[PDB]
Every structure is written in structure tokens, then in C-alpha cells.
Design a protein around this ligand. Structure first.
Ligand code: MET
Length: 245
């Protein structure tokens, strides 16, 4: 079907935003966009690589690059979407003043979002990392940890439910999944990453279909004021436009 494109997205608020892009694509081009929904960060790139979908819209470039290295995919970015500054959340404390020694702190376990989380924990002064780590520090790079915090690495989609675990005092959670239980950085975050970061999300395709006319249309539909306005609402200001104005 030459007027049909399948795009992989994550359930929750990101799916809602993608639905607006779907609408713009229909209204502006009469393009038939099908959203294929996922609730993890691994299967969407598998689906794309295998040709089960044409594009996906869920990852930032460090993540993409790591996926190319680790899985050997031939994928490429065809457009920016939003930066989603990541936040630390808790259902046990309201401030770092209350963080007890020995507390478990949950973070994503994939290399780039793990690194990102550790950099955030360093930024707010809870830990110090070795020099030269760049974007990919690991827990082995922690050189100061005065509260003797225990970093608990979890699959990203598990981070929202981790908040209810009896020992998890703090969790760094992608807004993707935080939004599934109605949390946003501005409303619920104890601390939040700077808007300026390398983590703008992407629309990604295979090398072989990066220039497909339907891909170009979808990118233009997503990169629209209508989509921004929707994102800014549902993410309560936690979505920064990543494309050229
Ligand atoms: C799969 S990389 C992480 C993407 C997620 N939406 C974020 O920007 O935190």
C-alpha cells in the first residue's frame, strides 16, 4: 500500500502525541499512518530492522548509536521530535533532605539512560563519577557516594512500579513511563535534568527507506505546531521542541 506507513511508538502520553501527528498527516497529505504500539525500548528497533514497521519514534541519538553497536542494525535518524528532560521521583520522600543512608535508588539499566541517570545523580550532588566517562558512566565509575546509596538497575518500563517497592526511595524515570502513572517532572519531580542535553528524541528508519516519500511526510506531520501544543499540554511543559522552527 503506497499510501500507508506503520510507525512504532510507546503507549501512554507519547502515543497520544503520535495520534496528533497521525491526524496532521491525514489532514495535510491524506497519508494513512498506522501506529504500532510498544511498551519497551527493545522491540521497536527489532520491528523496524525486520521490516515489520517503517519507522519508529521513541529514542534519542545516544540510545540509537548504542543499538547500532550492540545489535548491528542499519538505522538512521530522519528527524528530531522532543527533548524530555528526565526527573527523579519518589513515593517515600519529598526532598533529598529525607534520603536515608543505604537507600535504594532505581535507574534504567540500558547503557545510555543508565549513564544519563548517573550524570543526573552527580548533578544534584548525591554521587561523584570518575573523570572521562562522557555519556556512558556505569555504577563502577562511582567514586564518591557518602550516603552509601544502592543503585538498582531496572528495565526502563519497570521504573514506575518500582516506586511502590518497600526499599526504593528514589527512581530516575523516563518521562515515557512516568507519564503512564500521571507523573511529570514539573509537578512531581524532586530534581530534573537541564533542558539542554543530548537527548532529543528521533524519528528513525532503516537506511534503505530513509528517503521514502511517506517517511518525509510523517516527519513533517510530527514536526508541527499542533503536535507541539499537544505534547506541551500532556507533558506539562516537559517536552522541548527539537526541530527547526
Ligand atoms: C529509548 S531512549 C529514551 C527515550 C525517552 N523518551 C527519553 O527521552 O527519556
Amino acid at each position: 500500500d503506497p499510501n500507508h506507513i506503520k510507525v512504532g511508538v510507546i503507549v501512554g502520553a507519547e502515543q497520544q502525541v503520535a495520534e496528533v501527528a497521525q491526524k496532521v498527516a491525514k489532514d495535510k497529505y491524506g497519508l494513512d499512518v498506522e501506529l504500532v504500539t510498544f511498551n519497551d525500548y527493545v522491540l521497536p528497533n527489532e520491528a523496524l530492522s525486520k521490516g515489520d514497521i517503517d519507522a519508529n519514534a521513541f529514542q534519542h541519538k545516544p540510545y540509537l548509536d548504542q543499538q547500532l553497536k550492540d545489535r548491528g542494525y542499519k538505522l538512521v535518524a530522519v528527524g528530531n521530535t522532543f527533548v524530555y528532560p528526565i526527573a527523579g521521583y519518589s513515593k517515600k520522600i519529598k526532598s533529598l533532605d529525607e534520603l536515608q543512608d543505604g537507600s535504594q535508588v532505581a535507574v534504567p539499566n540500558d547503557p545510555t539512560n543508565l549513564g544519563r541517570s548517573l550524570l543526573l545523580l552527580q548533578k544534584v550532588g548525591l554521587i561523584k563519577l570518575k573523570d572521562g566517562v562522557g555519556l556512558l558512566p556505569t555504577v563502577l565509575d562511582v567514586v564518591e557516594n557518602p550516603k552509601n546509596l544502592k543503585i538498582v538497575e531496572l528495565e526502563a518500563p519497570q521504573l514506575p512500579r518500582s516506586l511502590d517497592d518497600a526499599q526504593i526511595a528514589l527512581a530516575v524515570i523516563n518521562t515515557t513511563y512516568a507519564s503512564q502513572i500521571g507523573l511529570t517532572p514539573a509537578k512531581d519531580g524532586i530534581f530534573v535534568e537541564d533542558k539542554e542535553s543530548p537527548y532529543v528524541n528521533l524519528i528513525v528508519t532503516r537506511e534503505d527507506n530513509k528517503d521514502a516519500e511517506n517517511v518525509k511526510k510523517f516527519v513533517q506531520a510530527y514536526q508541527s505546531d499542533e503536535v507541539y501544543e499537544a505534547a506541551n499540554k500532556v507533558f506539562n511543559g516537559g517536552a522541548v521542541k527539537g526541530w527547526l522552527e
